């Protein structure tokens, strides 16, 4: 009565075999899992990225991009695991365009099984040349699809107490961030990783595109974001403080968005944000592993131009490698207090 | 690497037929629905009431109750559209029982198939004795095994703000309530009521049990489920002002429920919420259309008692209830 109608949907494995990962494209992956592993695990003492667009929606721009944080990356190496974000899944507060895979035409004329091909064929494009990738895990099928690709999965702030996004992140393959409440509060966020630490058993679509009845293992490797709130922003030293006070035992390191709830509805107070953490970094914090980054090829945003978003706003390249470049300096500052 | 395995699913159409629905049973779930809408839409003055356990994990237990509420139910039709709470699905702040789809011998074997035949049997063994039914739609997969005999779905306070929920609600054909945010502010239910209003598209899985694109119409009938949280209590008549004020013009009628987030940690604070409720519904309150409360055969959390949350007991219920009825008649008066 409210189901419109149903459209066929290729299976992740005719998908798969459809677009091809490159060995590159694998091994890539596989890096960028080992790396922002060590990192939140604290075996490394580098800083772990996310940065990129708030979404993808040109696999042009986005290789252009890609291109660009792939040498910068090269040579920040050394204090800096980058990873890119190329989100194709976007949360709305009610209604707008949710991603590349939802209507890559973006034009309300939701080609998801184009939107699929996109998703793939970027991901194997930005991969491919040596670069990392994450994305948000907002839809619990979509994984099937690009799984192999990917070396950071994050759950939003408005599904981290989801309890198929808690069922859905103990079985993927690489770490996973989940976002505090949108309320600025950690609670849903440490409950989330407490959950996600565990088996679950739950109905789950297959790469044959069938249902079945999934088993996890649990993944040991989920930890929490800090992307402010209602309560608040909470990049600072204090909020940092109260947020290792309450990270249960065997807690991986904390993650930094410095946009969403921590730019506080203007893109432009992310370098700030980085000013403030660089400055926690370098002066021995060691808990603070990992921060995210709104960032593409030119500021601001747009409605529906080339290198801008048409969803969030993000900094532009230029102010970008300024704060990497920045955050990486704060980073041998502290392998220095260390000593 | 993160992924135990897979068990073959029997699909929602071969339960269907193995569980086939008897016409009683589909014309309870229409009825229903039918019920649900007049009164959250406010052509009836009756308030919508969906009461029942915590969970569903006994099917005799279950039965004996679903008896007396239709019963009862039969009493106080005159003021009161009772729906029983028949719930599968139980969202965990972290670990914990599911409910019965995901392990219906609760003894950890996990044995899903088992728990979708026993739960389509719990549901049609409900609506077959005239009773409609609701339950709480946490899984995006399950309700293709159950939509046809449930007539009112409720949305949780920790996936309200989901928008994969937000989308399957567009999807349901039935009444859909979103309970407010954990965080005790209604907001989020208030932008998944317009989300779910919408037509969407997605990925889902069809009655043949293989992954398809769905297009949905758009749910009108979505309304805000006021369940209190960290902000606290909201049911009183300054926090129901508030909400009143939060909801868009032409916005459903609100829902009231009496446990959870409301019931402040003591199941017996259930009655308590009643009185306040039932004052204000009394004195002309027309914006409260409905109510939900935990209740079982015995309360607490042995036969006839939850194994998940703490209920209050049936004479509770039914001194409860009448009252309610009596309010529902008062504020007919009022109006008049």
């Known amino acids: 009565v409210r189901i419109l109608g149903y459209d066929p949907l ?3 494995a005719l998908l798969q075999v459809q677009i091809p990962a490159t060995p590159t494209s694998l091994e890539t992956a596989k890096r960028g899992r080992r790396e922002a592993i060590d990192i939140i695990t604290g075996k490394d003492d580098r800083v772990l990225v996310i940065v990129g667009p708030c979404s ?12 660009r ?13 980058i990873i890119m974000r190329a989100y194709l ?15 890559p035409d973006v034009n309300n004329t939701f080609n998801i099984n184009k939107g699929l091909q996109s998703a793939r064929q970027l991901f194997v494009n930005l991969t491919n040349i040596g670069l990392p990738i994450g994305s948000e895990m907002l839809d619990t099928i979509s994984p099937q699809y690009l799984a192999d690709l990917v070396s950071f999965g994050a759950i939003g702030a408005r599904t981290t107490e989801s309890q198929l996004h808690r069922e859905l992140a103990s079985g993927l393959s690489f770490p996973v961030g989940f976002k505090n409440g949108t309320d600025g509060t950690l609670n849903v966020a440490v409950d989330a990783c ?22 996890t293992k649990g993944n040991e490797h989920c930890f929490v974001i800090l ?11 204090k909020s940092v403080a109260e947020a290792k006070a309450q990270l249960p035992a065997g807690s991986n390191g904390l993650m930094i968005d410095y946009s969403h709830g921590n730019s506080n509805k203007d893109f432009r107070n992310q370098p700030k944000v980085n000013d403030v953490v660089c400055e926690q970094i370098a002066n021995g914090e060691n808990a603070i592993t ?6 593409n090829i030119n500021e601001g945003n747009q409605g529906i131009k080339y290198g801008v978003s048409i969803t969030d706003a ?26």
């Open 69 to 81: 944080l792939k040498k910068l990356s090269d040579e920040l190496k050394g204090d800096l695991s």
């Open 227 to 237: 992307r402010g709130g209602k309560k608040g922003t909470n990049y600072d030293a």
């Open 10 to 12: 290729a299976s992740p």
């Open 314 to 339: 993000c900094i532009g390249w230029e102010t970008t490698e300024d704060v990497l470049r920045k955050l990486a300096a704060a980073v041998r500052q502290r392998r220095e207090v260390n000593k």
């Open 56 to 67: 993808i929606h040109d696999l042009e721009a986005a290789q252009e991009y890609a291109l």
């Open 89 to 103: 899944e976007k949360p709305r507060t009610t209604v707008g365009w949710k991603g590349l895979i939802n209507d």
């Open 194 to 215: 407490q959950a996600a630490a565990h088996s679950h058993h739950f109905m789950g679509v297959t790469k044959h595109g069938v249902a079945a009845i999934t088993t």
């Open 290 to 295: 990992g921060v995210m980054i709104e960032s």
